[PDB]
Each structure stands twice: as structure tokens, then as C-alpha cells.
Write a protein that binds this ligand. Structure first.
Ligand SMILES: CN(C)CCNC(=O)c1c(NC(=O)Cn2nc(C(F)(F)F)c3c2CCCC3)sc2c1CCCC2
Ligand SMILES: N[C@@H](CCC(=O)O)C(=O)O
Ligand SMILES: N[C@@H](CCC(=O)O)C(=O)O
Lengths: 263, 263
């Protein structure tokens, strides 16, 4: 019956969703800026809904605990009825597609390698054949799972190393992985999605680089709880925004117009 | 009730589906080879179905006639109940998504420019600012529609020219667009999807090139008639094949392992 305010789950991840410098001065949706802030606004406009942005409580993307089988992160928020829609850099994966609905992708990505500039690494193959430079991934998302599940020898070799490396190569947020790259003197490499990698490469201090090709190819989709009547209009909206070049415009705005490291 | 042989519609388009050299010697599905032949086999295996490959009668992707409102091509074949599934380089678009179901993409692409080697053209912007080199697109697919619908000035300028150009810049098949590039002495440029462009670039006589960036970003999806119970298992199969690197393997097989123009 009565339309209600749509509860949007998302995550603080640059440049998708960030607190404005002056957020303490602001209320509600106006506290945040970014690619997914703009995208939420476009989708809401095209679908005729009022919405509230909320940051996922546990600060995670979404993984199911192997013992409890409880979903955390934004996925768990959709699954347990805490949010109506996730509008974030949330990777489309088989295990997630089984439990939530995903629009067609609104952005493509692959897993990629971030280095401190001058690091003697060009590929995953380079990483796997050496021990001097540590490397790891984010917890509780699609990248860690990629390695954990991979039957490809190079990626199996990598996973075998990372899962038992000491101290831990895994980080809780993208910002911590980036900080580790910068602070580790070339002795840590970070495995993260190319979208995130390419953003950070254009931010001061301009000391990191994306090296080599992407290890996989895939995309982010807008997720809804399974069978939600939001799914259909939201998917049509993503296709429309795609076809109008709105998605390209937003990407240019937040990646390259914001570039700090040159033209 | 009783499972039946799934009727697959597809299109003869290199290197997705081609007649084997010795096809007259062969029967059924064995007449054809290609990326979508292999993909049909993987999907069928993962979904537990028997299938028949058939080439779309009219040799078109799919467009709705503005007066009759009748769909042609593979789309029309799904819509009118002539085929159960399309497994082809069929672009996910808003207008098609409204009338058929699409899996998540199994391959990404954008619109791109093919030139005869040495043609003084580097971008769509170059094409739009000149009259010496003609350019056009395929009929009855997503590329023509991109230009017809675009509010972006460069692409509106292009569309204005192409729709009234004499003789016609439009072609009935990819092979005819390619032949026109090769046979036109640098005086014709072809707008086609990057996947197709990149394949042809690696085929003898090795006289064409992809120039500049892609004009858009999108993907091919496996299409089913709207509400078909095939859609769910097929989508899960595409994600699984993606995540196993089967899609990457097939792309390498048909594009680059088949390369004729060097390493
Ligand atoms: C193994 N590889 C060869 C296959 C790669 N595979 C893909 O192309 C692919 C994706 N490709 C894209 O998202 C590219 N894309 N597609 C669209 C669409 F709407 F038309 F579908 C859009 C984009 C990016 C921009 C927005 C609109 S997402 C995704 C996959 C594999 C399964 C996991 C999720
Ligand atoms: N986009 C990823 C998070 C980042 C990563 O795993 O690298 C996900 O949805 O899990
Ligand atoms: N993949 C396109 C056909 C080729 C093109 O338009 O360039 C479609 O599904 O319509």
C-alpha cells in the first residue's frame, strides 16, 4: 500500500561514499558525497522513491560465516530485512546472487595489484614467485573469496601463502590496505579492485600504482532483497542511466576530474 | 512436466558462431564452432538440458519495427516463442530488457571504430568533423540505436550525417562492414562493437585497426523469453563460468590463440 522511505545500505569507500568535510554541520543524506551518493539520487528520481542513506553497521561488504552461516555486511543487511536496497561497490558473485537480487552492472572492475611506486612487481605471477614483498586482500568481500576458491595455479599459490602469512596480510578496510602499501617501503603489495586502485593512483601523495592486467572481469550491481518489487524498476533505471551516459559522467566526475597527480 | 530439447537461437558472427569448413559433412550442433558454440555447451551442461542450435532466420540481432511494432532477429524469436534461449553476442539494452530476460553479462564490450590501416582518424570526434571518410553501422542492432538515441553532441552530429548519407553507410552484416573497410581504400570507417573489432584486427589480411577508446561500456547477456524458468539456472551458470575463468579461457581460445597477425 502506502509508499515508504527506502532504507539504503552503503559503505564508506572512496570515492563511492565519503563524509563531506563539513558533515557534522549537516543532517541526513546531505552528510555524504560520492559516486554512489549521486547514483542513489538518480536511481531514486527514476524510480519515484524517497530514501534514507545509512552506512552498514559492521563496515563490511558481505560474507557468510562458515559455521553460523550468518551473512554480515551490506549483504546481511538485505538478507535480514534491515535495509531495502544496497547502492555501493558491491560485486556480483554466484553465492550472493543466490540470496539477493542484483541489477545489471553499473560499473565494471577486476581484481588488480597496487604497489608503492618502484616496487619490482609487474604481475600476480611475480608476486607468487617471491617472498620479500608481502601481499594480501580485504576481509569479508569478493577479492578474498576469489583467491580462496581459485583452482588457477598462480592464484592457488598466492592463496596458500596469504592464508598462513605472518603477520596477517589481510586488512579490514581499503584505507588500511592503502596505508600499508604507503607505509611499508615497497614491502607490501595490495590486491584490490581496479576501480579502487585507479582512484587511489590519482590521489596525493601520488605514491602508488596499478600494475599489470586485471586478474578477473566482473561488475558492481545494485542489490535488493530477493523478490523485492524494487528490483525491476531499479534494473531499468541502471540501464537507462547507462544508455544516457550518466554512469560515464559520474565516473569521470569522481575519478578523473578529481585527479590530483596530473592530467 | 517432461523436459524437452531446448531450441537455441544464435547468429553467424565471427568468432561466436561460424560454420566449420566441413559442415556439409556434419549434422546438428556439430556443424558450428565458436565462442557461443562452446558457451552453449557449458551452459547446457551446467543446467542439465539437451539443446538444438539454430541460426536466426532473418540474420538479425533484434529491433522493433516502429510502425508494425514487430520484433525481428533473435529478440523476435524469443518474443514470438520460436526459440527458448538466445546464446549469442546480444547486447543488453533497456528496450530489450523490457521484453526478454537477460543473464548477467558473459562478455563486456563498447562501440568502437574500425579503420583500414593508415586512415587519418583517431576518434569519433575526428570522424564527426569531416566528410571525406564515410562511416556507418550495422542495421537492426544496438549500435545503430545508440547513435539514433544519443543526446551527446559528437554522436548526434554523427547520427545526423549517417541517417542521410548517400550512398547508404549502413550494412546488413558485420562481414559486409568489414569488407567495405578493406575495399574502400581508407575512405570508409566502420562503427562496431570492440569485441568484434578486436577479433578482426587479429585476422589476415591484417589490414584493419581499432582506433581510440570505446564510445560506451556494456555487455552481452544470454536472453530467454520473459518469465522463462530457464532464466535463473542460466544466470547462475554464467556466474559460475565467469568465476571459474571459463569465460576468460573461451575468449583467449577464439580471439588470441586464433591470432593471425603476430604475438
Ligand atoms: C571472462 N570475461 C571474458 C567476461 C567478462 N564478464 C563480464 O563482462 C561481466 C560484467 N561486465 C560488465 O559489467 C560490463 N558491463 N555490462 C553492462 C550491461 F549492463 F550491459 F550488462 C554494463 C557494464 C559496465 C558499465 C555499465 C553497464 S559484470 C560481471 C561479469 C562476469 C560475471 C560477474 C559480474
Ligand atoms: N567490491 C567487493 C569489496 C572489495 C574487495 O573485495 O576487494 C565486494 O563486494 O566484496
Ligand atoms: N551486439 C549487437 C549487434 C552488433 C552491433 O549493433 O554492432 C546487438 O545485440 O544488437
Amino acid at each position: 500500500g502506502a509508499n515508504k522511505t527506502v532504507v539504503v545500505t552503503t559503505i564508506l569507500e572512496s570515492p563511492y561514499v565519503m563524509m563531506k568535510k563539513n558533515h557534522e554541520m549537516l543532517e541526513g543524506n546531505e552528510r555524504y558525497e560520492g559516486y554512489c551518493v549521486d547514483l542513489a539520487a538518480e536511481i531514486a528520481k527514476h524510480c519515484g522513491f524517497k530514501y534514507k542513506l545509512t552506512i552498514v553497521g559492521d563496515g563490511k561488504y558481505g560474507a557468510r560465516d562458515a559455521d553460523t552461516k550468518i551473512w554480515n555486511g551490506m549483504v546481511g543487511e538485505l538478507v535480514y530485512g534491515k535495509a531495502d536496497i544496497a547502492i555501493a561497490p558491491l560485486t556480483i558473485t554466484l553465492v550472493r546472487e543466490e540470496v539477493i537480487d542484483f541489477s545489471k552492472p553499473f560499473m565494471s572492475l577486476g581484481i588488480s595489484i597496487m604497489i608503492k611506486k618502484g616496487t619490482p612487481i609487474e604481475s600476480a605471477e611475480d608476486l607468487s614467485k617471491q617472498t620479500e614483498i608481502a601481499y594480501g586482500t580485504l576481509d569479508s568481500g569478493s577479492t578474498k573469496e576469489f583467491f580462496r576458491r581459485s583452482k588457477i595455479a598462480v592464484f592457488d599459490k598466492m592463496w596458500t601463502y596469504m592464508r598462513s602469512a605472518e603477520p596477517s596480510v589481510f586488512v579490514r578496510t581499503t584505507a588500511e590496505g592503502v596505508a600499508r602499501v604507503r607505509k611499508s617501503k615497497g614491502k607490501y603489495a595490495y590486491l584490490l579492485e581496479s576501480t579502487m586502485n585507479e582512484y587511489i593512483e590519482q590521489r596525493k601523495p601520488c605514491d602508488t600504482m596499478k600494475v599489470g592486467g586485471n586478474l578477473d572481469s566482473k561488475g558492481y550491481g545494485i542489490a535488493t532483497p530477493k523478490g523485492s518489487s524494487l528490483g525491476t524498476p531499479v534494473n531499468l533505471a541502471v540501464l537507462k542511466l547507462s544508455e544516457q551516459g550518466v554512469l560515464d559522467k559520474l565516473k569521470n566526475k569522481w575519478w578523473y576530474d578529481k585527479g590530483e597527480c596530473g592530467a
